[PDB]
Amino acid sequence: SWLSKTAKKLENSAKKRISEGIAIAIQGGPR
């Protein structure tokens, strides 16, 4: 969707959260 085509770039920023969500976890940075 031309509407989701501009929002896709907004969700594309979440891809960093999924990649980190497993990374950080894999690092056990926190508790």
Domain boundaries, position 23: 1-31
CA distances from 30 to 5, 9, 10 (A): 35, 29, 27
Experimental method: NMR
CA distance 25 to 1: 34
CA distance 14 to 24: 15
1-31: string of b/e by CB count within 10 Å (b at 16+)? Answer: eeeeeeeeeeeeeeeeeeeeeeeeeeeeeee
Torsion (CA) 17, 19, 24, 28 in degrees, nearest 10: 120
Overall domain count for the chain: 1
